[PDB]
Every structure is written in structure tokens, then in C-alpha cells.
Write a protein that holds these residues in place. Structure first.
Motif, PDB file in Angstrom:
ATOM      1  N   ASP A  36      39.229  37.542  43.013  1.00  0.00           N
ATOM      2  CA  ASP A  36      40.574  38.660  42.426  1.00  0.00           C
ATOM      3  C   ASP A  36      39.299  39.745  43.007  1.00  0.00           C
ATOM      4  O   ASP A  36      38.007  39.571  43.425  1.00  0.00           O
ATOM      5  CB  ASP A  36      40.574  38.362  40.714  1.00  0.00           C
ATOM      6  CG  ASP A  36      40.994  37.309  40.835  1.00  0.00           C
ATOM      7  OD1 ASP A  36      41.862  36.693  41.580  1.00  0.00           O
ATOM      8  OD2 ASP A  36      41.124  36.545  39.860  1.00  0.00           O
ATOM      9  N   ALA A  37      40.546  41.144  43.269  1.00  0.00           N
ATOM     10  CA  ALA A  37      39.593  41.749  43.172  1.00  0.00           C
ATOM     11  C   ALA A  37      40.205  43.107  42.534  1.00  0.00           C
ATOM     12  O   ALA A  37      42.053  43.155  42.810  1.00  0.00           O
ATOM     13  CB  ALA A  37      38.735  43.184  44.906  1.00  0.00           C
ATOM     14  N   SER A  38      39.510  44.642  42.374  1.00  0.00           N
ATOM     15  CA  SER A  38      40.880  45.596  41.602  1.00  0.00           C
ATOM     16  C   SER A  38      39.576  46.632  41.743  1.00  0.00           C
ATOM     17  O   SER A  38      38.531  46.563  41.405  1.00  0.00           O
ATOM     18  CB  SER A  38      41.163  45.378  40.468  1.00  0.00           C
ATOM     19  OG  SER A  38      41.436  46.847  39.463  1.00  0.00           O
ATOM     20  N   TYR A  39      39.772  48.000  42.213  1.00  0.00           N
ATOM     21  CA  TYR A  39      39.202  48.740  42.255  1.00  0.00           C
ATOM     22  C   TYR A  39      38.757  49.372  40.886  1.00  0.00           C
ATOM     23  O   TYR A  39      37.160  49.150  41.054  1.00  0.00           O
ATOM     24  CB  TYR A  39      40.419  50.489  42.729  1.00  0.00           C
ATOM     25  CG  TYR A  39      38.842  51.525  42.150  1.00  0.00           C
ATOM     26  CD1 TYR A  39      37.965  51.945  42.857  1.00  0.00           C
ATOM     27  CD2 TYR A  39      39.650  52.063  41.271  1.00  0.00           C
ATOM     28  CE1 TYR A  39      37.391  53.214  42.474  1.00  0.00           C
ATOM     29  CE2 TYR A  39      39.248  53.297  39.636  1.00  0.00           C
ATOM     30  CZ  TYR A  39      38.139  53.804  41.279  1.00  0.00           C
ATOM     31  OH  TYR A  39      37.346  54.930  40.264  1.00  0.00           O
ATOM     32  N   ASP A  40      39.334  49.141  39.595  1.00  0.00           N
ATOM     33  CA  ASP A  40      38.288  49.601  38.622  1.00  0.00           C
ATOM     34  C   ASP A  40      38.639  48.725  37.419  1.00  0.00           C
ATOM     35  O   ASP A  40      38.446  48.976  36.464  1.00  0.00           O
ATOM     36  CB  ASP A  40      39.212  50.996  38.125  1.00  0.00           C
ATOM     37  CG  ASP A  40      40.560  50.879  37.703  1.00  0.00           C
ATOM     38  OD1 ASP A  40      40.794  50.182  37.922  1.00  0.00           O
ATOM     39  OD2 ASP A  40      41.120  52.172  37.756  1.00  0.00           O
ATOM     40  N   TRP A  41      39.629  47.451  37.617  1.00  0.00           N
ATOM     41  CA  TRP A  41      39.967  46.217  36.513  1.00  0.00           C
ATOM     42  C   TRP A  41      40.452  47.099  35.603  1.00  0.00           C
ATOM     43  O   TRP A  41      39.700  46.744  33.971  1.00  0.00           O
ATOM     44  CB  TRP A  41      39.167  45.761  36.825  1.00  0.00           C
ATOM     45  CG  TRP A  41      38.427  44.189  37.584  1.00  0.00           C
ATOM     46  CD1 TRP A  41      37.696  44.770  38.719  1.00  0.00           C
ATOM     47  CD2 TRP A  41      39.056  42.933  37.752  1.00  0.00           C
ATOM     48  NE1 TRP A  41      38.276  43.397  39.228  1.00  0.00           N
ATOM     49  CE2 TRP A  41      38.225  41.862  38.280  1.00  0.00           C
ATOM     50  CE3 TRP A  41      39.771  42.330  37.028  1.00  0.00           C
ATOM     51  CZ2 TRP A  41      38.865  40.937  39.276  1.00  0.00           C
ATOM     52  CZ3 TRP A  41      40.714  41.534  37.545  1.00  0.00           C
ATOM     53  CH2 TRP A  41      40.207  40.481  38.344  1.00  0.00           C
ATOM     54  N   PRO A  42      41.627  47.655  35.353  1.00  0.00           N
ATOM     55  CA  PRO A  42      42.568  48.324  34.034  1.00  0.00           C
ATOM     56  C   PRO A  42      43.030  47.745  33.481  1.00  0.00           C
ATOM     57  O   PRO A  42      43.653  46.625  33.358  1.00  0.00           O
ATOM     58  CB  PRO A  42      43.005  49.684  34.932  1.00  0.00           C
ATOM     59  CG  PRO A  42      43.412  49.185  36.334  1.00  0.00           C
ATOM     60  CD  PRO A  42      42.399  48.060  36.249  1.00  0.00           C
ATOM     61  N   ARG A  43      44.028  48.225  32.049  1.00  0.00           N
ATOM     62  CA  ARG A  43      45.103  47.509  31.616  1.00  0.00           C
ATOM     63  C   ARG A  43      46.312  47.758  32.521  1.00  0.00           C
ATOM     64  O   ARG A  43      46.058  48.234  33.215  1.00  0.00           O
ATOM     65  CB  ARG A  43      45.154  48.338  30.548  1.00  0.00           C
ATOM     66  CG  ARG A  43      45.204  47.559  29.088  1.00  0.00           C
ATOM     67  CD  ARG A  43      46.663  48.186  28.223  1.00  0.00           C
ATOM     68  NE  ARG A  43      47.325  47.395  27.923  1.00  0.00           N
ATOM     69  CZ  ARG A  43      47.465  47.163  26.589  1.00  0.00           C
ATOM     70  NH1 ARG A  43      47.144  47.990  25.372  1.00  0.00           N
ATOM     71  NH2 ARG A  43      48.578  46.039  25.588  1.00  0.00           N
ATOM     72  N   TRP A  44      47.481  47.469  31.553  1.00  0.00           N
ATOM     73  CA  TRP A  44      48.688  47.169  32.557  1.00  0.00           C
ATOM     74  C   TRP A  44      48.988  48.380  32.291  1.00  0.00           C
ATOM     75  O   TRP A  44      48.441  48.919  31.475  1.00  0.00           O
ATOM     76  CB  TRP A  44      49.465  46.309  32.023  1.00  0.00           C
ATOM     77  CG  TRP A  44      49.183  44.948  32.335  1.00  0.00           C
ATOM     78  CD1 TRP A  44      48.764  44.072  30.672  1.00  0.00           C
ATOM     79  CD2 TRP A  44      49.134  44.145  32.916  1.00  0.00           C
ATOM     80  NE1 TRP A  44      48.399  42.649  31.674  1.00  0.00           N
ATOM     81  CE2 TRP A  44      48.785  42.588  32.958  1.00  0.00           C
ATOM     82  CE3 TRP A  44      49.443  44.565  34.556  1.00  0.00           C
ATOM     83  CZ2 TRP A  44      48.459  41.620  34.470  1.00  0.00           C
ATOM     84  CZ3 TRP A  44      49.262  43.461  36.263  1.00  0.00           C
ATOM     85  CH2 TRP A  44      49.371  42.379  35.067  1.00  0.00           C
ATOM     86  N   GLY A  45      49.916  49.335  33.318  1.00  0.00           N
ATOM     87  CA  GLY A  45      50.410  50.424  33.463  1.00  0.00           C
ATOM     88  C   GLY A  45      49.496  51.213  33.739  1.00  0.00           C
ATOM     89  O   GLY A  45      49.708  52.823  33.898  1.00  0.00           O
ATOM     90  N   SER A  46      48.595  50.465  34.884  1.00  0.00           N
ATOM     91  CA  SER A  46      46.932  52.021  35.326  1.00  0.00           C
ATOM     92  C   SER A  46      48.066  52.186  36.555  1.00  0.00           C
ATOM     93  O   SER A  46      48.308  51.453  37.108  1.00  0.00           O
ATOM     94  CB  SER A  46      46.254  51.376  35.260  1.00  0.00           C
ATOM     95  OG  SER A  46      45.660  51.039  33.553  1.00  0.00           O
ATOM     96  N   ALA A  47      47.039  52.834  37.155  1.00  0.00           N
ATOM     97  CA  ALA A  47      47.359  52.945  38.493  1.00  0.00           C
ATOM     98  C   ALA A  47      46.626  52.545  39.163  1.00  0.00           C
ATOM     99  O   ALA A  47      45.847  51.463  38.669  1.00  0.00           O
ATOM    100  CB  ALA A  47      46.117  55.210  39.159  1.00  0.00           C
ATOM    101  N   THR A  48      47.266  51.793  40.743  1.00  0.00           N
ATOM    102  CA  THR A  48      46.529  50.506  41.504  1.00  0.00           C
ATOM    103  C   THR A  48      46.901  51.175  42.753  1.00  0.00           C
ATOM    104  O   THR A  48      47.262  52.084  43.056  1.00  0.00           O
ATOM    105  CB  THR A  48      47.762  49.635  41.094  1.00  0.00           C
ATOM    106  OG1 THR A  48      48.618  49.217  42.022  1.00  0.00           O
ATOM    107  CG2 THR A  48      48.256  49.337  39.450  1.00  0.00           C
TER     108      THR A  48
END
Ligand SMILES: [Zn+2]
Length: 182
Positions: free
Chosen positions: A36-48
Motif C-alpha cells: 500500500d502507499a499513500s502520500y500522508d496516510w490520513p483520515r477519511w474525507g481527506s484530500a487524495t
């Protein structure tokens, strides 16, 4: 073992996302085909952010939240937890072709079932239609070593080794994407 010049990381060139430990597509079994990979690993409703093709090949849009890119070699990549898909069935693409975004809502994120901790891309390696081990695979200059359990992220066992700089790259640190290796 895919050609070392076939694949880049599945986000835009020049940008950096945080990967997690290798795991099976389901997160349980064998082989460790996915990370898996995510820019910032944030909460739902965040910028993607933008998911791009890791390599040249043919697109299959399996659903609003899943895409596969298939090379003539048989080598293929899977992309789950997708949203806002901007490619079509039969569309030929190159490494770095924007496929869409990873989902910022759990509803879309799990259009084909499963579970998820928050916004991220689940990204899998295939060959002739079956998932295969990420062990030894290159994505740009990086050669991946697979950990000992699903989601193992101990930097001693799971790492991205840059073959051009001699650097070791850990889970949950920004991983720069320079593009396809030569
Ligand atoms: Zn995953």
C-alpha cells in the motif's frame, strides 16, 4: 522476476508517497504480491492524490474502484481502492499515465468488498493473470525485499533498496519516484 526497466512506482514521477509492508492481495495468505502507499496516510474525507500506471500496457476497468494494467509480457499490475477512474477498457497506457485517484471515502474504497484503515492505494504484482511475489522486483531504481509476515514493515526485513545510490528505504517514509530505470 520482472525486467528491472519495466516498472516505476504507481504515483506521479517527481513526487513521494509512503508505502507500507508487503502483503497478499487479501492481506492474509501467500504470496506477498501487494504493498500500500499513500502520500500522508490520513483520515477519511481527506484530500487524495494521483495513481499512475506503473508500466506500459492495456487497461481493464473492473469497477469504479479497481483497475488492472496488463503488459504484452503477461506481467501486470493491479490497483484497488481507486476512485475517479479516467481511463477506459482497452486503453493502452504508458508508465506515468494517470489512472485516477485513491479513494477518500470508505464507500468507494470498498466497492468490491474488503476492509481499510483509511485512504490508500492497494497495489499488486501479477503475471499471466495471477498474483506473484514482490520479492526482488524493481520499481525504478528500487529493488523490493519482502518481509516475513503480511504487512511486516521492520526496515531490517522489508525495504526498498535503491540500486543506483546504495540507499535503503523504509516503510512509512517518503519514497521519491524518479521514473523508469534504465
Ligand atoms: Zn493492501
Amino acid at each position: 522476476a520482472p525486467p528491472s526497466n519495466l516498472m516505476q512506482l504507481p504515483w506521479r514521477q517527481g513526487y513521494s508517497w509512503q508505502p507500507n509492508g508487503a502483503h497478499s492481495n487479501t492481506g492474509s495468505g501467500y504470496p506477498y504480491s501487494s504493498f500500500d502507499a499513500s502520500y500522508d496516510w490520513p483520515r477519511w474525507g481527506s484530500a487524495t492524490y494521483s495513481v499512475v500506471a506503473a508500466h506500459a500496457g492495456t487497461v481493464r476497468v473492473l469497477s469504479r474502484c479497481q483497475v488492472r494494467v496488463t503488459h504484452p509480457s503477461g506481467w501486470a499490475t493491479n490497483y484497488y481502492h481507486m476512485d475517479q477512474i479516467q481511463v477506459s477498457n482497452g486503453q493502452q497506457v504508458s508508465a506515468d499515465t494517470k489512472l485516477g485517484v485513491y479513494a477518500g471515502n470508505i464507500n468507494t474504497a470498498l466497492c468490491e468488498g474488503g476492509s481499510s484503515t483509511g485512504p490508500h492505494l492497494h497495489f499488486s504484482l501479477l503475471y499471466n493473470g495471477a498474483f506473484v511475489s514482490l520479492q526482488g522486483a524493481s520499481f525504478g531504481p528500487y529493488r523490493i525485499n519482502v518481509g516475513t509476515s503480511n504487512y511486516d514493515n521492520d526496515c531490517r526485513r522489508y525495504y526498498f533498496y535503491n540500486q543506483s545510490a546504495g540507499t535503503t528505504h523504509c516503510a512509512f517514509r517518503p519514497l521519491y519516484n524518479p521514473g523508469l530505470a534504465l
